[PDB]
Amino acid sequence: NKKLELMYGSLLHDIGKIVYRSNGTHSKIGSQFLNKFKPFQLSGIVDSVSYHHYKELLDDSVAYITYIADNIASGFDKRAPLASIFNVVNSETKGLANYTYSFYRYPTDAKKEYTSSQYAALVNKMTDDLSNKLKVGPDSFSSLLQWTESLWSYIPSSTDTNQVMDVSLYDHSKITCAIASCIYDYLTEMNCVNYRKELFSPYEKTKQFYQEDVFLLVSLDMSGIQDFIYNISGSKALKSLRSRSFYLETMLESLVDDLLSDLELSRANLLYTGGGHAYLLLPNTERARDVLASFEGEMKEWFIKIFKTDLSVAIAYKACTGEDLMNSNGTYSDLWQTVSRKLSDKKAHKYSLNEIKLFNSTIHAGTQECKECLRSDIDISEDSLCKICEGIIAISNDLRDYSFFVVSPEGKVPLPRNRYLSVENQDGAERKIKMNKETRIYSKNQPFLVTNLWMCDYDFSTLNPETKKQGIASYVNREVGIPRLGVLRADIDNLGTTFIKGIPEQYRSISRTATLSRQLSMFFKFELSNILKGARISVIYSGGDDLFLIGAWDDVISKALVLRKAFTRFSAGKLTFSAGIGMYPVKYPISKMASETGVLEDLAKRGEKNQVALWNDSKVFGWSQLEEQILKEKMIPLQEALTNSQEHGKSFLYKMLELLRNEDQINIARLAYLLARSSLSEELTQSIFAWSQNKQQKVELITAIEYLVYQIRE
Amino acid sequence: LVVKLVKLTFKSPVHFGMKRLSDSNHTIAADTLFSALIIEALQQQLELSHLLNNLVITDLFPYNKTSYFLPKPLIRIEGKKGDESGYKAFKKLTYIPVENYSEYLRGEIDSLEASKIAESLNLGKASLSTKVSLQAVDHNGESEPYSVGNFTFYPESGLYFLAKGNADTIGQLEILMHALQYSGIGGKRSAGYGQFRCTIEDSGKFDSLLSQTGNIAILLSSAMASDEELVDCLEDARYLLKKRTGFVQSKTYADQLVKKKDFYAFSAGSTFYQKFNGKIFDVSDNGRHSVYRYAKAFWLEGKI
Amino acid sequence: MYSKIRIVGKIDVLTGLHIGGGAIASPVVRDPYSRLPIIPGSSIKGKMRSLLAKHIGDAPEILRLFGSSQKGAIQSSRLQISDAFFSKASQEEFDKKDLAYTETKFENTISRLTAVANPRQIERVTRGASFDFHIIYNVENINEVMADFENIKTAIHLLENDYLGGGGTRGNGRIRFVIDSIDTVVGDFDSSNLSIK
Ligand SMILES: Nc1ncnc2c1ncn2[C@@H]1O[C@H](COP(=O)(O)NP(=O)(O)OP(=O)(O)O)[C@@H](O)[C@H]1O
Ligand SMILES: Nc1ncnc2c1ncn2[C@@H]1O[C@H](COP(=O)(O)NP(=O)(O)OP(=O)(O)O)[C@@H](O)[C@H]1O
Ligand SMILES: [Mg+2]
Numbered sequence A: 001n002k003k004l005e006l007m008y009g010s011l012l013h014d015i016g017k018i019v020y021r022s023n024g025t026h027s028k029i030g031s032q033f034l035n036k037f038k039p040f041q042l043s044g045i046v047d048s049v050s051y052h053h054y055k056e057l058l059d060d061s062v063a064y065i066t067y068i069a070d071n072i073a074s075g076f077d078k079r080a081p082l083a084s085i086f087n088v089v090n091s092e093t094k095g096l097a098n099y100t101y102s103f104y105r106y107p108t109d110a111k112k113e114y115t116s117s118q119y120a121a122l123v124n125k126m127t128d129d130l131s132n133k134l135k136v137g138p139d140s141f142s143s144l145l146q147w148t149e150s151l152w153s154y155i156p157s158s159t160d161t162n163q164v165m166d167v168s169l170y171d172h173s174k175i176t177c178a179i180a181s182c183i184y185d186y187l188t189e190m191n192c193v194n195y196r197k198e199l200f201s202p203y204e205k206t207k208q209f210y211q212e213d214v215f216l217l218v219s220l221d222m223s224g225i226q227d228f229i230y231n232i233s234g235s236k237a238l239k240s241l242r243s244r245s246f247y248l249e250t251m252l253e254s255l256v257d258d259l260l261s262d263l264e265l266s267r268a269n270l271l272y273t274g275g276g277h278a279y280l281l282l283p284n285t286e287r288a289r290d291v292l293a294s295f296e297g298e299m300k301e302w303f304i305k306i307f308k309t310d311l312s313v314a315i316a317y318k319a320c321t322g323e324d325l326m327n328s329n330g331t332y333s334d335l336w337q338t339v340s341r342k343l344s345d346k347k348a349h350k351y352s353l354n355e356i357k358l359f360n361s362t363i364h365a366g367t368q369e370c371k372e373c374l375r376s377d378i379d380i381s382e383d384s385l386c387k388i389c390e391g392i393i394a395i396s397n398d399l400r401d402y403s404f405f406v407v408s409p410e411g412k413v414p415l416p417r418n419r420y421l422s423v424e425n426q427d428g429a430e431r432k433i434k435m436n437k438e439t440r441i442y443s444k445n446q447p448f449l450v451t452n453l454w455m456c457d458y459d460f461s462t463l464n465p466e467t468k469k470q471g472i473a474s475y476v477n478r479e480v481g482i483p484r485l486g487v488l489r490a491d492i493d494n495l496g497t498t499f500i501k502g503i504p505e506q507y508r509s510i511s512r513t514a515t516l517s518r519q520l521s522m523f524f525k526f527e528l529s530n531i532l533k534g535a536r537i538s539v540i541y542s543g544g545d546d547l548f549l550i551g552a553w554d555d556v557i558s559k560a561l562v563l564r565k566a567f568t569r570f571s572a573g574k575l576t577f578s579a580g581i582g583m584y585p586v587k588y589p590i591s592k593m594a595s596e597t598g599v600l601e602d603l604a605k606r607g608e609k610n611q612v613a614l615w616n617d618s619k620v621f622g623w624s625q626l627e628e629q630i631l632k633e634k635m636i637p638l639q640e641a642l643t644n645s646q647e648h649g650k651s652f653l654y655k656m657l658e659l660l661r662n663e664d665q666i667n668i669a670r671l672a673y674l675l676a677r678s679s680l681s682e683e684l685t686q687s688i689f690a691w692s693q694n695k696q697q698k699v700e701l702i703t704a705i706e707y708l709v710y711q712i713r714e
Numbered sequence B: 001l002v003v004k005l006v007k008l009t010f011k012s013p014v015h016f017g018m019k020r021l022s023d024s025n026h027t028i029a030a031d032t033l034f035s036a037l038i039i040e041a042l043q044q045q046l047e048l049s050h051l052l053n054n055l056v057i058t059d060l061f062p063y064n065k066t067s068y069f070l071p072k073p074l075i076r077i078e079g080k081k082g083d084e085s086g087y088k089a090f091k092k093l094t095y096i097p098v099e100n101y102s103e104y105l106r107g108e109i110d111s112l113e114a115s116k117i118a119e120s121l122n123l124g125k126a127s128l129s130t131k132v133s134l135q136a137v138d139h140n141g142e143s144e145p146y147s148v149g150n151f152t153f154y155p156e157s158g159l160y161f162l163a164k165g166n167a168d169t170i171g172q173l174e175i176l177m178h179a180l181q182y183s184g185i186g187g188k189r190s191a192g193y194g195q196f197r198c199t200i201e202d203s204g205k206f207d208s209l210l211s212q213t214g215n216i217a218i219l220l221s222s223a224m225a226s227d228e229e230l231v232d233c234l235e236d237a238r239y240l241l242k243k244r245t246g247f248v249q250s251k252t253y254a255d256q257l258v259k260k261k262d263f264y265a266f267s268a269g270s271t272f273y274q275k276f277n278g279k280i281f282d283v284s285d286n287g288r289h290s291v292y293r294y295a296k297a298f299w300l301e302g303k304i
Numbered sequence C: 001m002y003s004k005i006r007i008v009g010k011i012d013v014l015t016g017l018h019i020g021g022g023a024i025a026s027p028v029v030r031d032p033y034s035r036l037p038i039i040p041g042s043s044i045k046g047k048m049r050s051l052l053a054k055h056i057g058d059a060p061e062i063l064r065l066f067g068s069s070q071k072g073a074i075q076s077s078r079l080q081i082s083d084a085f086f087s088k089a090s091q092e093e094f095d096k097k098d099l100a101y102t103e104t105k106f107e108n109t110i111s112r113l114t115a116v117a118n119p120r121q122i123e124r125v126t127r128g129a130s131f132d133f134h135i136i137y138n139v140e141n142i143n144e145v146m147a148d149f150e151n152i153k154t155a156i157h158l159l160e161n162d163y164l165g166g167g168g169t170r171g172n173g174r175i176r177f178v179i180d181s182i183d184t185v186v187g188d189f190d191s192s193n194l195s196i197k
């Protein structure tokens, strides 16, 4: 188990930095710390921890691989905090910030230092965990990786103030472990018995190995997600939307897990997953390429068997050298762009001739078809429900209660390699893993053979038992206000250009991209639940850079503004997102809801593309314009003034809308007369008249009037 | 083979459905138009030989006051050195004006130009009309609302397409289109949708492009080749498979309404290095008559 | 062979017409682009079908006229009634006099218990308005053209003595039909003798 020893010694190679910061070099401190625990006293682990630098470093030990992986990954005030990754993001345009994390966490820009007492607490926690909970073994490395993620995510990887301390200890350790695994696979494939002569003895060999194409950057993308999730019918579609989204998420996670298990790699090699997309870093071995080809073929066959053209997966990989990961020759972003272009080329020519011929070889007509997704080639049981459809329906009422997802030979919704996904609690997962081996368990947002997935599972109806029966339909149940559902579609702007070109060329590295991706994924899959607290909102999906929310319309707009503020706070102002907000009746077609909200969002993604579209194409405002110039300036005074009115001013607001829609000067005179007869504050009448006179303020006035009318209705 | 431009200006909004009665599509493929033409020929008791043997038609493409729009070719386009998201513009682009078509094939259309082209389309407005069914009320029941997704065109916008064939086929298509003006195309034709008026003329502006020779071929209609041509026509191809579905609209196919066999066809804009001649497939499952699905290929050659 | 008769004309609004469908209290259905009041063809088709079913009384003639989806006896709809759009002459007449196309009607509801009047606002099409209506009759059988047209005449008479949308028992939706022309646009059938209303 030399590979397992290398993984353990590469994930813990810089474990001595915490102890050194807790008051020789960090390698000796790490060796001494790991020598206190019997399971971690393996020769390879200790050699990797204490020998990974040139001055310190059997001619075949894994210490050389760990040293070169640390050099590739990386590219003194102990109290130095962790700098936010967005300090250098888009710094060529918006400048360099100085945001840092305090000991989820938001950077606050303030001047701070990490006290040695906090490091002592971290060291005590690590000492407790390494003995009471953690162990070594082939199947125990995932728990170690999750523990490292839970502990080291906000500790800086390096405290040197000469350069930018963006990368945390967890990101650096995970990237080093992934690179070490790839290099070990590459060396094993090349039958390199001696590691010192291959990598270390002259520095010329080190540079030459830096020249060699050792890694593969792999992109895996799902196609057909929007049509699968949102193009559904029936009155029970709102109760299955989140179930379909969760099913797609878990299928993507199972895809990446099977891919990693094929190559005998851990999840440290999974650079990014989310939004139907996945970036992985594999070895450049022939075994890896054959594994990738076989995986692509078998997943294409499975997706054709189960969904035909409804869903598909495209995989594209590119060979890469160490200087590409280190951006030594300015060829780092070119690698990612080429991978994306190869992925798009794969998505262009998607099927072979035989697959298309079998697609057109239909024997029997559709006959009966399912209520949802209107699918007829699959067998249809009673109640007109397809197998996948009824399995998804069975997944709900279990997803809202149980927090464990079991991929096992028996379950509800099919998954590749003849497996099935079901939802159970701890007892169910334990029984499932004990009955049949090769059964995998995922946990939902659970702090540290269980793989923890970060998902946004915030549903307001599940908080209260009576509203739990009617999931999304309960948000239209209200005493005042129009009974409507708001749909929010949010999307980050120019994220691809932010990754490719936003980071300066001096700071481009695999660790920087990994840290930025992890921060964005943590914000979307974890922080949205915290942001939306106490709101009538269900999150259909939240991952990648997109976001789909369905709730009460007023709650949706308020939480959209709150989300914009929180995203501005998180990204330090370097990232902006656009949004579309639609207002629909209950029983409105969910496919129409999604399509029209996507149209609104795409309307907002024009020009500056930092805008929000509101209910139609004529209400595309800015974020500050909507929050302040529409709600905090026009709607609040008018609402406060018209609350005194006996009828709340519904008819008078209707007359104002009628007068505002027309564009005649005599009708401006009519508006002035109506304001005079309103019997409200004279300064308010003057303000309203001025707002109606001015263009780009009459639209805001109309939006405020309509919002107030919706608020006071039945 | 003479190419005729048929322009359709729509009086009432149209309901072009993809899978639901709430879907409001702005166009129809060659399959829908050819099925409407076959239904019209059966209504007028004409021969089906010219439609089934010598008529090659394109999809229904948008047109506005200024230009005629052709489907976006599925070509490999190169962006800037660091503009990764700009490619999304070319992903959102669906129709390109004819004058700006060749420039797109040569790669001289930028991401901002692609966005300008995408926003320059002025076809019309898609809406969703909510209706009700009061038939159950008279039987001690309740009203049943439903939704119809319609699309209304702007005053000088509409849908054009190109027809290719001999003189007899062209004339028969003139009569069929004249009857189709009053039959209507799309969804609720009997409930106030799909009525249009069509004009058939020559197309010099399109004969300039259809006489062009190049290294790539672009599909102008939803087409698919038989197995023998599919063996060699799929190399280095960039296409998009569309699932053609639906129910059989016929009063004599069977007793009750049933669906036809699932079909898969290449999209309009798919680029091939081998030009395949499609055919008219049968999607009938042991019915009284054979339901036809037109998947012949109308080609536009170009230089990449 | 196959014939289609085009019946164009005007629907004149005798009393304010409200067909349900910014923020307006009970708005009327409108053209999405021009924002002009319309009379959906489905509304006219359903109202005439209900009136003819009341008159005759589904019955076979209703199935010939408005089509049927019944199993076995799948009947094609002979009547295609298009949406009635706001007339251009009525548009010019309403642009003159500075008259809006739609009016707001205020109504009360006096409670049977507390004698308290709940107000309610609806929107109607102004009585001076006219709508250009267009109907296509498909001659699938030549022998029933006279019967189909007398049924259409009965339905049109009932509609002229009925309303078209909204609450017409409370004085809404009264309309009149003026038949500008009845001309056979497709086929050789002679529709000169045919007449509606
Ligand atoms: N599990 C999920 N549930 C709901 N939405 C998701 C989920 N995963 C991803 N998404 C979102 O759904 C979209 C995926 O839609 P698509 O499958 O169409 N992928 P897209 O890039 O848009 O076009 P392709 O080139 O892949 O054919 C993502 O871009 C996200 O916006
Ligand atoms: N946390 C992440 N780390 C790495 N890649 C991500 C992450 N989140 C999303 N992505 C990727 O980010 C891309 C977002 O693509 P989009 O389709 O959203 N277009 P974008 O580049 O954001 O510019 P806009 O047109 O939206 O203004 C996806 O295609 C994903 O591959
Ligand atoms: Mg984005």
Ligand SMILES: [Mg+2]
Binding pocket: A491, A492, A544, A545, A546
């Ligand atoms: Mg996105």
